Amino acid sequence: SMNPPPPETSNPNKPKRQTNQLQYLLRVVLKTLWKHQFAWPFQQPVDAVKLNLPDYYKIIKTPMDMGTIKKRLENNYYWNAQECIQDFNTMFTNCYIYNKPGDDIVLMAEALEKLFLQKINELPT
């Protein structure tokens, strides 16, 4: 495929280690966002070939999506919660730098981001 390979989602030799914050990120934050009615454009990598977006991956240096984040959480890929939070932030940034302000997708991202940030403001210690 002419799309980039998807981001890595498992680390073969990394120990399995939970934290309160990582449990929250999976079981509260990702759970809530995945089921939101506006989640679907964000549930998988952007398929720029299928969407005929030849400049998407020129504009977006660090692709990220909730499908990747979900797998990373399930596979205990993240060493800490901040890494996961950064991936969410990157996902939203990508949407806002590529898509025109006021496009449907942007309003959808804004609703998801608001919900995300409301949950992060209640992150455990």
């Binding site: 506006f38 969407l51 005929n52 030849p54 400049d55 504009i59 590529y98 025109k100 449907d104 997708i105």
Partner: peptide
Amino acid sequence: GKAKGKKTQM
């Protein structure tokens, strides 16, 4: 780059 398609129902 090119706009994405229609995504919500108004």
